[PDB]
C-alpha cells in the first residue's frame, strides 16, 4: 500500500 511492496 504506502510501504515496501504494498
Same mark, same amino acid.
Given at each position: 500500500? $504506502?510501504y515496501? $511492496?504494498?
Amino acid at each position: 500500500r $504506502r510501504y515496501y $511492496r504494498f
